[PDB]
Amino acid sequence: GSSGSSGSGEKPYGCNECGKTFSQKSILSAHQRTHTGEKPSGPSSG
């Protein structure tokens, strides 16, 4: 049947880090670059 969960193919990428989506990685990767080094704003936990 499905033999693979593939939607339309608009935003196959996602920044789990925050929970966003992107059309292509090239764009996401960069968006994740800023994410790096997540400092504890409130609750000190990883």
Binding site for Zn ion (CB under 5 A): 15, 17-18, 20
Tell me which DSSP letter residue 43 carries.
Answer: S
In a 3-state reduction of DSSP, which class is residue 28?
helix
The DSSP code for 17 is T
Nearer Cβ to Zn ion (18/30): 18
Distance of CA 23 to the CA centre of its chain: 11
Q: Which is nearer to Zn ion, 20 or 25 (CB)?
A: 20
To the nearest whole angstrom, how small is the minimum distance from the Cβ of residue 28 to Zn ion?
8
Give min distance, CB of 37 to Zn ion, in A: 13
